[PDB]
Amino acid sequence: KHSSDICIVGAGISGLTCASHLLDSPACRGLSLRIFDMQQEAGGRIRSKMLDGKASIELGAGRYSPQLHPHFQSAMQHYSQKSEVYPFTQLKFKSHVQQKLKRAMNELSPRLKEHGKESFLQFVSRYQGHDSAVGMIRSMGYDALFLPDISAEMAYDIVGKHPEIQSVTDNDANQWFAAETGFAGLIQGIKAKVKAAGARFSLGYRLLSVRTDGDGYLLQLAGDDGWKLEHRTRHLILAIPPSAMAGLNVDFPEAWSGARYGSLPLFKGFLTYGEPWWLDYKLDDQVLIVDNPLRKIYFKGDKYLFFYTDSEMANYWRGCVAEGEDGYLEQIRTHLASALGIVRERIPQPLAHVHKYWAHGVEFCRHPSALSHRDSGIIACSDAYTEHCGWMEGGLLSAREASRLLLQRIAA
Amino acid sequence: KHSSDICIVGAGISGLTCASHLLDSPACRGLSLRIFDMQQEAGGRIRSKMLDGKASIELGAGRYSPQLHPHFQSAMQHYSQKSEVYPFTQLKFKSHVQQKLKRAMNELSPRLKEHGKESFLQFVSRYQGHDSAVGMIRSMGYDALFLPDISAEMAYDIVGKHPEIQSVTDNDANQWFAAETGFAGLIQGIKAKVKAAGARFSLGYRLLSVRTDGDGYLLQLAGDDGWKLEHRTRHLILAIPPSAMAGLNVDFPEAWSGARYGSLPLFKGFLTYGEPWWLDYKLDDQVLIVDNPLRKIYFKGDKYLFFYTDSEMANYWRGCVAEGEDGYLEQIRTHLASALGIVRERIPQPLAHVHKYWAHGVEFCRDDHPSALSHRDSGIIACSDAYTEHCGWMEGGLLSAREASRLLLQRIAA
Numbered sequence: 001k002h003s004s005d006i007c008i009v010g011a012g013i014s015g016l017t018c019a020s021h022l023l024d025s026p027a028c029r030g031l032s033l034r035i036f037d038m039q040q041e042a043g044g045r046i047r048s049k050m051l052d053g054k055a056s057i058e059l060g061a062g063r064y065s066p067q068l069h070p071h072f073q074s075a076m077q078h079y080s081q082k083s084e085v086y087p088f089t090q091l092k093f094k095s096h097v098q099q100k101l102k103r104a105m106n107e108l109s110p111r112l113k114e115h116g117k118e119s120f121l122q123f124v125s126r127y128q129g130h131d132s133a134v135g136m137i138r139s140m141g142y143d144a145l146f147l148p149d150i151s152a153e154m155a156y157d158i159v160g161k162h163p164e165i166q167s168v169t170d171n172d173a174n175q176w177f178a179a180e181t182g183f184a185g186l187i188q189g190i191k192a193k194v195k196a197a198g199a200r201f202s203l204g205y206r207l208l209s210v211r212t213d214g215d216g217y218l219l220q221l222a223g224d225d226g227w228k229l230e231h232r233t234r235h236l237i238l239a240i241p242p243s244a245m246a247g248l249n250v251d252f253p254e255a256w257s258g259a260r261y262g263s264l265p266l267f268k269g270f271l272t273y274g275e276p277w278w279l280d281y282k283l284d285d286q287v288l289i290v291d292n293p294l295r296k297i298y299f300k301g302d303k304y305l306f307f308y309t310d311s312e313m314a315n316y317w318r319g320c321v322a323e324g325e326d327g328y329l330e331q332i333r334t335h336l337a338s339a340l341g342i343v344r345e346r347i348p349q350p351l352a353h354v355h356k357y358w359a360h361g362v363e364f365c366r367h368p369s370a371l372s373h374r375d376s377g378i379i380a381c382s383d384a385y386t387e388h389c390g391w392m393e394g395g396l397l398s399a400r401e402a403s404r405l406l407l408q409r410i411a412a
Numbered sequence: 413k414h415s416s417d418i419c420i421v422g423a424g425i426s427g428l429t430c431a432s433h434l435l436d437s438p439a440c441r442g443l444s445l446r447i448f449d450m451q452q453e454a455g456g457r458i459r460s461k462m463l464d465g466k467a468s469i470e471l472g473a474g475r476y477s478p479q480l481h482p483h484f485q486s487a488m489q490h491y492s493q494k495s496e497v498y499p500f501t502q503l504k505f506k507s508h509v510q511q512k513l514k515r516a517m518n519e520l521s522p523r524l525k526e527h528g529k530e531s532f533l534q535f536v537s538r539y540q541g542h543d544s545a546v547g548m549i550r551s552m553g554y555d556a557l558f559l560p561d562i563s564a565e566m567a568y569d570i571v572g573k574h575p576e577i578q579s580v581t582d583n584d585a586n587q588w589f590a591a592e593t594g595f596a597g598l599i600q601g602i603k604a605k606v607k608a609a610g611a612r613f614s615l616g617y618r619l620l621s622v623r624t625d626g627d628g629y630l631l632q633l634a635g636d637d638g639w640k641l642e643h644r645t646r647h648l649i650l651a652i653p654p655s656a657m658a659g660l661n662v663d664f665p666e667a668w669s670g671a672r673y674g675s676l677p678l679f680k681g682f683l684t685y686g687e688p689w690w691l692d693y694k695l696d697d698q699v700l701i702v703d704n705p706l707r708k709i710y711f712k713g714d715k716y717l718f719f720y721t722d723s724e725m726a727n728y729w730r731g732c733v734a735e736g737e738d739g740y741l742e743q744i745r746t747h748l749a750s751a752l753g754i755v756r757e758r759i760p761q762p763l764a765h766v767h768k769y770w771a772h773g774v775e776f777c778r779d780d781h782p783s784a785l786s787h788r789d790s791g792i793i794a795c796s797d798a799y800t801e802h803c804g805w806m807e808g809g810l811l812s813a814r815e816a817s818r819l820l821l822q823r824i825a826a
């Protein structure tokens with residue numbers, strides 16, 4: 001028999017936190033808990049690596065704020081993970097274009113009850129024309145701000161919650177932190193506690209379909225080596241994002257809430273060198289926002305540099321990687337030269353590099369913390385159902401509602 | 413998001429060898445060549461690993477014979493890969509049944525003129541008790557021989573070509589060798605040659621569908637991170653096994669061949685320890701064949717032990733692994749103890765272990781099979797060990813590659 005009292009599908013931060021709240025409850029004593037994830041490691045969109053075995057880099061989530069994410073900060077402290085300052089909170093090379101929009105967003109601000117539901121592009125193109133609003137929006141380096149899908153009110157929220165651009169609004173006093181050893185250290189800590197309390201992990205299995213089976217459920221899964229597996233459980237939490245809920249047979253979203261749901265792709269590229277050649281330019285711990293395809297360029301101490309893009313520009317770099325490594329590195333070299341106002345020859349070739357593309361990097365909200373299927377009583381858990389859609393903090397908030405909803409299914 | 417004159421899907425030993433034959437031909441000067449594979453490394457069912465950083469193990473193919481496999485032997489020499497003696501060619505500790513094995517099999521062999529194409533379990537059970545047949549057959553450790561789809565004729569060929577049991581049909585003349593650094597060194601040798609001649613690799617991309625498009629073909633591919641990709645080519649080789657052919661939209665096997673194909677699952681588990689405890693029993697470089705679910709147990713010098721199963725026993729171990737690593741390892745200790753005749757508590761715990769399950773480890777033909785195929789309509793060529801006399805061996809992949817390169821070069825010329 002492959003069975004369990006409680007089953008959680010998804011071992012990101014949401015699924016693992018669900019598991020930990022449940023095992024804390026006296027009402028779960030003597031119940032068995034099983035956790036599935038289609039990946040071979042837990043963590044989901046938290047993915048830490050060593051670049052050339054020298055320094056730790058974040059391929060997914062990278063930074064947090066005590067002002068915006070107090071539950072995440074508390075989790076770091078509870079599991080004895082050390083934080084370090086995240087330096088990329090100002091631009092040394094602020095333009096008047098950047099300066100204008102600060103003032104532009106302040107003056108346009110009251111028109112947001114009037115027009116706040118139209119797109120951010122349509123909104124801003126009233127101050128001056130359309131051409132002028134394109135130059136202002138581009139200077140913030142997040143291309144998702146150009147989507148029709150993103151409203152003016154949504155964009156003011158995005159802008160004010162990101163460290164590179166937060167001073168454009170009046171959130172210039174928020175502080176930002178990174179993990180010394182990488183956020184995978186927090187994931188490992190939660191996983192270890194969950195295992196020590198008796199939960200059993202089955203990594204490398206993908207859920208394909210769910211069917212109600214009297215008072216319980218039957219799950220069909222597929223291992224990454226082809227092995228088919230059936231699992232029966234009495235209580236089910238689906239701790240996966242909306243994009244993955246839609247791939248099941250569970251009538252998502254109509255049977256779960258009114259909303260529709262959307263997502264953005266994200267791309268990050270990291271490069272190391274034989275010598276930290278940007279110290280002469282005094283670029284260490286600085287971020288440059290530029291119009292060319294790198295968009296946002298970061299220099300991390302004397303260790304490495306990287307760039308970060310979303311939406312159409314993320315898809316641009318992923319297609320460029322597919323056409324060959326050679327041209328990819330040569331394209332980066334050209335755009336590093338433009339951004340620094342020098343020639344191509346002054347920029348060395350790298351020793352090593354690494355990149356990551358996330359087809360559904362941010363999944364958002366277009367609404368209670370966690371969801372229930374009206375008929376079957378399955379619970380859904382994701383950062384996209386919260387006010388912190390797009391952030392680890394949202395995963396923690398959804399997990400605590402979701403584990404609450406399930407504790408009342410068990411005591412009913 | 414581009415194109416090529418020639419495309420190869422499949423970077424196993426078949427696909428890489430196809431590319432090597434093509435790039436060697438004068439007829440491909442100036443032609444561009446693109447290679448796709450859904451894994452992030454080349455090799456296919458050849459998978460070498462460094463287990464606990466002290467010894468190299470084979471999770472897929474592991475042995476070859478110069479007498480049975482001359483082309484594979486020549487390939488090893490061409491790329492300067494060094495070989496070493498493979499020890500598991502005799503049973504030092506035979507059971508009673510295993511000693512009767514060769515004489516029973518020698519006496520039964522003439523009756524294969526009448527009851528030839530019969531299932532091998534039936535054949536052997538017609539001339540002894542069926543209870544006595546089950547005992548004879550299982551003493552050889554390959555559970556494929558109990559399958560209704562395996563004739564008595566196929567079984568005699570399987571027994572005679574495997575090093576642990578070849579002595580049962582007087583094929584001891586065959587020597588066996590393994591690779592000194594792993595067969596991944598052969599694979600890296602061909603890959604570097606093909607790359608140095610200008611071929612381009614796209615690993616991590618899975619072919620989902622192909623359609624004719626005037627001149628050539630349009631391919632839909634999915635990266636292992638979601639990125640969809642469309643690729644255009646004028647000449648196409650699918651160097652993938654029949655199980656993977658079936659998942660496409662190419663009418664396999666109807667539009668390709670008059671045969672049918674099956675497969676067997678395979679499973680291997682490797683274990684290392686703080687101390688080579690099996691030396692006390694003189695088990696180093698020896699293989700035991702047992703009735704219990706380990707079936708075939710191997711002791712590699714003083715470095716590690718492993719076990720190898722197929723068919724229902726391979727699925728048995730894979731199901732065991734799904735229920736948890738702890739129950740798996742305790743199950744292994746129980747069966748090691750009964751194999752050696754001692755109590756559970758004298759078998760140590762392992763430092764490290766690794767296992768691999770192949771859902772379609774062996775693919776073969778059920779029915780004068782040509783070594784490569786061609787689509788009746790579209791001119792796509794298929795390449796695989798399964799289309800040869802040597803189905804289930806790397807030597808078949810080398811043979812199939814030669815024929816596929818020829819078919820493709822005749823369509824490129826003219």
Ligand SMILES: Cc1cc2nc3c(=O)[nH]c(=O)nc-3n(C[C@H](O)[C@H](O)[C@H](O)COP(=O)(O)OP(=O)(O)OC[C@H]3O[C@@H](n4cnc5c(N)ncnc54)[C@H](O)[C@@H]3O)c2cc1C
Nearest residue numbers: 010012013014038044045060061062063206207361391392
């Ligand atoms: C590039 C990038 C940068 C980011 N930076 C930050 C940041 O700086 N600060 C911040 O707060 N957040 C950041 N995030 C977001 C953060 O990563 C997410 O908000 C959070 O990790 C989501 O947690 P989750 O557990 O809800 O979902 P996930 O991390 O997505 O985990 C979901 C899990 O469910 C599994 N799964 C899915 N489907 C199925 C199925 N059918 N069967 C089985 N298993 C399945 C998946 O494998 C996955 O592990 C970033 C994200 C990206 C992509």
Ligand SMILES: Cc1cc2nc3c(=O)[nH]c(=O)nc-3n(C[C@H](O)[C@H](O)[C@H](O)COP(=O)(O)OP(=O)(O)OC[C@H]3O[C@@H](n4cnc5c(N)ncnc54)[C@H](O)[C@@H]3O)c2cc1C
Nearest residue numbers: 422424425426450456457472473474475619656773805806
């Ligand atoms: C456990 C085990 C032990 C073995 N031991 C031996 C031995 O000792 N001696 C011996 O000679 N042979 C042995 N073999 C067999 C040997 O591994 C194979 O015969 C040979 O390697 C197969 O070569 P191939 O290139 O034709 O196919 P494969 O190795 O199977 O290569 C096929 C490739 O195509 C890829 N692919 C498939 N489908 C698709 C798709 N839709 N899109 C994209 N890409 C795709 C796969 O990822 C794979 O890389 C063993 C096999 C196994 C499983």
Ligand SMILES: N[C@@H](Cc1c[nH]c2ccccc12)C(=O)O
Nearest residue numbers: 142144158162264310362390391
């Ligand atoms: N805030 C995360 C990801 C993200 C959330 N919302 C976004 C909107 C647009 C682009 C990225 C995001 C980051 O630091 O990158």
Ligand SMILES: N[C@@H](Cc1c[nH]c2ccccc12)C(=O)O
Nearest residue numbers: 554556570574676722774804805
């Ligand atoms: N030759 C491979 C695989 C194989 C070929 N024919 C087989 C029949 C049964 C089991 C495995 C095989 C091995 O001996 O391991």
Ligand SMILES: [Mg+2]
Nearest residue numbers: 010012015239
């Ligand atoms: Mg999760």
Ligand SMILES: [Mg+2]
Nearest residue numbers: 422424427651
């Ligand atoms: Mg191949």
